[PDB]
Design a protein around this motif. Sequence first.
Motif, PDB file in Angstrom:
ATOM      1  N   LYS G  97       0.838  -1.211   0.000  1.00 34.37           N
ATOM      2  CA  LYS G  97       0.000   0.000   0.000  1.00 34.37           C
ATOM      3  C   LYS G  97       0.865   1.251   0.000  1.00 34.37           C
ATOM      4  O   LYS G  97       1.560   1.533   0.976  1.00 34.37           O
ATOM      5  CB  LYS G  97      -0.898   0.012   1.237  1.00 34.37           C
ATOM      6  CG  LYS G  97      -1.895  -1.143   1.159  1.00 34.37           C
ATOM      7  CD  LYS G  97      -2.814  -1.103   2.382  1.00 34.37           C
ATOM      8  CE  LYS G  97      -3.830  -2.245   2.303  1.00 34.37           C
ATOM      9  NZ  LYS G  97      -4.721  -2.196   3.497  1.00 34.37           N
ATOM     10  N   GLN G  99      -0.473   4.501  -1.472  1.00 35.15           N
ATOM     11  CA  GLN G  99      -1.384   5.611  -1.224  1.00 35.15           C
ATOM     12  C   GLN G  99      -0.663   6.941  -1.388  1.00 35.15           C
ATOM     13  O   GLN G  99      -0.669   7.776  -0.485  1.00 35.15           O
ATOM     14  CB  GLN G  99      -1.965   5.513   0.187  1.00 35.15           C
ATOM     15  CG  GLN G  99      -2.903   4.308   0.276  1.00 35.15           C
ATOM     16  CD  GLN G  99      -3.474   4.195   1.686  1.00 35.15           C
ATOM     17  OE1 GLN G  99      -3.634   5.204   2.373  1.00 35.15           O
ATOM     18  NE2 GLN G  99      -3.794   3.021   2.164  1.00 35.15           N
ATOM     19  N   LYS G 102      -2.935  12.183  -0.565  1.00 33.99           N
ATOM     20  CA  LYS G 102      -4.081  12.008   0.341  1.00 33.99           C
ATOM     21  C   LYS G 102      -5.378  12.453  -0.334  1.00 33.99           C
ATOM     22  O   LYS G 102      -5.354  13.152  -1.347  1.00 33.99           O
ATOM     23  CB  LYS G 102      -3.861  12.826   1.621  1.00 33.99           C
ATOM     24  CG  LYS G 102      -3.766  14.315   1.273  1.00 33.99           C
ATOM     25  CD  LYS G 102      -3.455  15.121   2.535  1.00 33.99           C
ATOM     26  CE  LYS G 102      -3.344  16.602   2.173  1.00 33.99           C
ATOM     27  NZ  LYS G 102      -4.658  17.088   1.659  1.00 33.99           N
TER      28      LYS G 102
ATOM     29  N   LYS H  97      -1.578  -0.860  -4.278  1.00 29.02           N
ATOM     30  CA  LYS H  97      -2.374   0.376  -4.295  1.00 29.02           C
ATOM     31  C   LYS H  97      -1.455   1.589  -4.369  1.00 29.02           C
ATOM     32  O   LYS H  97      -0.816   1.957  -3.383  1.00 29.02           O
ATOM     33  CB  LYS H  97      -3.229   0.459  -3.027  1.00 29.02           C
ATOM     34  CG  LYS H  97      -4.218  -0.710  -3.003  1.00 29.02           C
ATOM     35  CD  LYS H  97      -5.101  -0.607  -1.756  1.00 29.02           C
ATOM     36  CE  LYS H  97      -6.042  -1.814  -1.692  1.00 29.02           C
ATOM     37  NZ  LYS H  97      -6.935  -1.815  -2.884  1.00 29.02           N
ATOM     38  N   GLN H  99      -2.446   4.498  -6.750  1.00 30.25           N
ATOM     39  CA  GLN H  99      -3.128   5.353  -7.713  1.00 30.25           C
ATOM     40  C   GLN H  99      -2.778   4.936  -9.137  1.00 30.25           C
ATOM     41  O   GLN H  99      -2.651   5.775 -10.029  1.00 30.25           O
ATOM     42  CB  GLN H  99      -2.723   6.812  -7.492  1.00 30.25           C
ATOM     43  CG  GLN H  99      -3.287   7.300  -6.156  1.00 30.25           C
ATOM     44  CD  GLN H  99      -2.722   8.676  -5.822  1.00 30.25           C
ATOM     45  OE1 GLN H  99      -1.612   9.009  -6.236  1.00 30.25           O
ATOM     46  NE2 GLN H  99      -3.423   9.497  -5.090  1.00 30.25           N
TER      47      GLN H  99
END
Lengths: 140, 140, 140, 140, 140, 140, 140, 140, 140, 140
Positions: G97, G99, G102, H97, H99
């Motif tokens: 992950k 990410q 934000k 993950k 984007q």
Amino acid sequence: MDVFMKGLSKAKEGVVAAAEKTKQGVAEAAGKTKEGVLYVGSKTKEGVVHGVATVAEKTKEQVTNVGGAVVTGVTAVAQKTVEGAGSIAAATGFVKKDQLGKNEEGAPQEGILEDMPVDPDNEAYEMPSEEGYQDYEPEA
Amino acid sequence: MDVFMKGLSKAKEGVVAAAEKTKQGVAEAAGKTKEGVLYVGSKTKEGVVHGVATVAEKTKEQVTNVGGAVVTGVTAVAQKTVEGAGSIAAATGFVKKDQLGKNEEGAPQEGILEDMPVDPDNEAYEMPSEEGYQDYEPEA
Amino acid sequence: MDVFMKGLSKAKEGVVAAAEKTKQGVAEAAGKTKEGVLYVGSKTKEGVVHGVATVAEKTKEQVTNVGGAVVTGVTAVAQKTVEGAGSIAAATGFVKKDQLGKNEEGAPQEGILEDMPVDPDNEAYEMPSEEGYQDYEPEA
Amino acid sequence: MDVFMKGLSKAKEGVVAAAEKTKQGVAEAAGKTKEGVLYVGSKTKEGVVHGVATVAEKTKEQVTNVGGAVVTGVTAVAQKTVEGAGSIAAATGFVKKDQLGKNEEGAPQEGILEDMPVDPDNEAYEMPSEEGYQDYEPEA
Amino acid sequence: MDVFMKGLSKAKEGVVAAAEKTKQGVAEAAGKTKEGVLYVGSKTKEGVVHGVATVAEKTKEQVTNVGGAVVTGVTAVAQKTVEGAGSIAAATGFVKKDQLGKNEEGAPQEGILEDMPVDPDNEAYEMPSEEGYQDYEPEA
Amino acid sequence: MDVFMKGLSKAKEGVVAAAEKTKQGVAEAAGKTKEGVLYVGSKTKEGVVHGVATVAEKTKEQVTNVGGAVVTGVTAVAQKTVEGAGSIAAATGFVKKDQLGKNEEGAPQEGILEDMPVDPDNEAYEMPSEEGYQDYEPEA
Amino acid sequence: MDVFMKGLSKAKEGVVAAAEKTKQGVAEAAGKTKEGVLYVGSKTKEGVVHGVATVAEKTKEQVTNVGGAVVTGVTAVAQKTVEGAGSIAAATGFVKKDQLGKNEEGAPQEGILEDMPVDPDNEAYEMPSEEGYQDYEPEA
Amino acid sequence: MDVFMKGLSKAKEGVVAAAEKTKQGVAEAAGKTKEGVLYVGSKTKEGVVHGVATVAEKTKEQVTNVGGAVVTGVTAVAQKTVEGAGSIAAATGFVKKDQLGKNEEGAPQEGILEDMPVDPDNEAYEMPSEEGYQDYEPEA
Amino acid sequence: MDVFMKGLSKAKEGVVAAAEKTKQGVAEAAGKTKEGVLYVGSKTKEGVVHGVATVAEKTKEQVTNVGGAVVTGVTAVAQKTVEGAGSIAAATGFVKKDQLGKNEEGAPQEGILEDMPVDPDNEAYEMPSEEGYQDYEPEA
Amino acid sequence: MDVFMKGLSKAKEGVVAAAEKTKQGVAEAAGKTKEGVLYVGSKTKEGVVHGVATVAEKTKEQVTNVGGAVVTGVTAVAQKTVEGAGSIAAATGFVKKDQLGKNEEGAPQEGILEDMPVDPDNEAYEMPSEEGYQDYEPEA
């Protein structure tokens, strides 16, 4: 007619006249079959470990409390040489705890407050039920 | 002089045909079959581990509480050489905790360090121990 | 010196002379069939592990509480050489929370009689004048 | 007068060579069938692992609580050599948590590796004056 | 018994006064059939793993709570050599929580952003040597 | 091993067979039929894995809660050599949340002109040619 | 009844060929039938995997909650060599992950502009809200 | 066209087609029937996988919640060698993950030099070569 | 006189088993087959460990409480040389805590005034010839 | 002095050259087969440990309380040389804890209760006015 002319000087091309031939090396037996090494009935072992554990009855582990670390049973390791600062070769149960921080302590600056009286004046006390408003044919 | 009768020619006669005087080099061995190495009945092992564990009854693990780490059963490792700073070769149960955060202090300077002295005249200065022995026994 | 007449026995040999036959060789031979290496009955093993675990009754794992890490059963590893800073070869249960950091101590930790002492940087001077009111609270 | 020019050499009916003169006539056993290597009854193994686990009754895993990591059963690995900074060869249960931390931009190590250290007598430079033979000594 | 010993199939072999003094005639024997390598009864294995797990009763997994990672059962791997910084060869349960968000830095201060070309100090294309004047960095 | 019932060996000179007689040794031929290699009774395996798991009763998985990763059952892998920075050969349950490293390399150089926030239609009027004529009929 | 080979004049011959004859005297073998390689009883395997799993009762998977990844059952892979930075050979349950950034990158906005005429689209078949001119343009 | 006339002694076999002929019944004593290779009782396998799973009772999958990825049952793969940066050979449950962002594949490009003008200096020599003014007649 | 002697007057001790063999004899030879090294009946081991533990009855582990660390069973390690500051070769149960030390106050187990039980054997302070300080004062 | 140093060229008697010839082995036997080393019946061991523990009855571990560390059973280690400041070669049960005074306050005796349940917004405005200018060049 040659594109480039060449000339000899020192005549360095093979003065040593080296060749595959031994001076007066002629003989009935020359260059015998060299013998390397012979190994018969030899045992060699490097870095080997063997552990055997047998348990019949029970251990009986009711309540166990340990702060640091605890190792039970059998542990074996095979090593020759080891190097390293702060390094560990064989250690059963390793635990390190640190929290020195700034090595300083200070009281909480905050923790202060000020007067804040709401001065209650509503005797309704919420009580959502039993609304004073009486409508027509109340659903409730 | 005359008594010498030359040499290797005393006969200076006999026959030249079927003389077979010369060895003709009938037997001649050159470049014998080199022998490498021979291995018969040899055992070689490097980096090998074998562990056997047998449990009949039950262990009885009711309540277990450990802060650091705990390892039970059998652990075996085969190694020869190891190198590395802070590195670990064999360790049963490794746990390192170093929580760092939240600081009451926030001033530009963390501290003024009152430890200005670098050569204290105390502690180390205290040397009540005597290098000489209590009893004297010199040899003349 | 007749001493003893007869005694004929010249048949008995008292010298070796050359009464010995020689075995026929390979005669002429060049470039014999070179022999590499021979291996008969040899065992070689490198990097091998074997673990066997047998459990009859039950372990009885009611309530287990561990902060760091816990490893139970049997663990075996076969290695020869290992290298690496902060590297781990064999570790049962590895857990690291937070980290302090790394400092080569670039600043001069120790000094030899400094004629003109100077702080690493900043070096902010101050002078007496007025003390901060933020401190005690003497209401009366 | 030779009636037969042939010389009645009917005795011969085959020729292997003409006039004999320094004729070695080798062509015998040349370039023997070289023998590579022979392997009979040999076992070789590199990087092999075998684990066997048998459980009859039940383990009884009611409530289990672990902060870091926990590994139960049997784990075996076969390796020879390993290299890498911060690398791990064999680790049962690996967990790293960092709430607060920072990287030095991944700048290169200083690697000073000094090869010219300075450590002479280091005699105390200071030399406080003391009464005695020096100067005047009327009191003593 | 037709001759009483030294008879029957025994007559005469070889041994000649002079007849057939020449053996056969000539032998070629050139370029013998080279023999590669022979392998009989040999076992070779590289990188092999075999794991067997048998469970009769039940494990009884009511409530299990683990923060990091947990691996149960049997895990086996066969490897010879491995290399790589921060690389892992064999690890049961690997979890790293790097997370994000740095409040320690807070608002910017010593950012020193590259301004527009002003009074260039790089007169020469090549950068100036770092070495200039220093001799108090080590001091042993 | 546990020693062999054969007994303790410290010598036992190897048995040597008599050469007896050589089978001719001369076939009188040129360019004999070269013999490659012979293989009889040989086993070779590289990169092989075999796992067997048998479960009778039930596991009983009521409530399971894991933050990182969890692997249960049997996992086996066969490898010889592996290389790669940050690479993993064998890992049961791998989970990484966020990463300390960052320093984005910046946005790609393509130009915001690639966008079409106005006049979505394009090349609508443009249609001088289509590099040859071809029929088309998408499924419908 | 299968003839292995045909013998030549096995029975004793009354007479023998006269060596005097020059015809069909002798014949040397040239260019013998080269023999490649012979393989009898050999097993070769490269990159093979076999997994067997048998379950009688039920697993009982009521409520399962995992953040990262979870793999249950049996997983087996056969490999020899692997290379690649950040590459993974065998991993059960892989989740990363990042990410990047934000939610809601743009700073809070009180909707300075109620309208937003961008990226025109057909309002046909859509009527989420009343849109049009307030003017009714009365007939008279 | 429709030829039917045969040449008298005019026709002759070509060396092209005659070049290829069956290798059997060749002349004896010379050019013996070469023997290729013989294979009897040999097993060869490369890249093979076999998985068997049997389930009697029910799994009981009431409520399952997983953030990353989950793989249950049996997975098997047969491979020999694999290469590729960021590539994965065998992974059960892969989820990233970020984007759907790109990590930009390929090595980094050289740094930016000049807009176009160049000033060669390493090409300096005793007799520098002039560059043709042709420059392929550029539009400029 | 009484001196005794043999009939043959031999002045040499008797000998048996000449053994002979190893006779170089007379013959030409150049470059004899060099002999490497011979190993017969040799055992070599470096870095090896073997531990065996057998338990019949039960251990009986009711309640166990340990602050530092505890290791039970059998631990064995094989090493040759080790180096590293603060490094540990073999340690059973290692736990280091550096967070905050408690006020573990405790008085010393020894602390008395030097009463000087023994004093120089001085006649002035010692008068064995007289017991007590009683003064003689007889009437006669 | 004496003109023409040359002289005494003719020897009074005999020859100046050494009677013995240098570098022998002109023929016959030259370069005998060198013999390396011979090993028969030799045992060599370096770094080896072997421990055996057998327990019949039960240990009877009811209640155990230890502050520092406790090790029971059998521990054996094989080492040759070790070096390192503060380093430990062999230690059964190692536990080190800090010993600092202070601890005047912050004791667990004091209870902490969260106040201001409403949690009102605080002053996060950490951006006070500061002196500074884009350009600084007083002309006075």
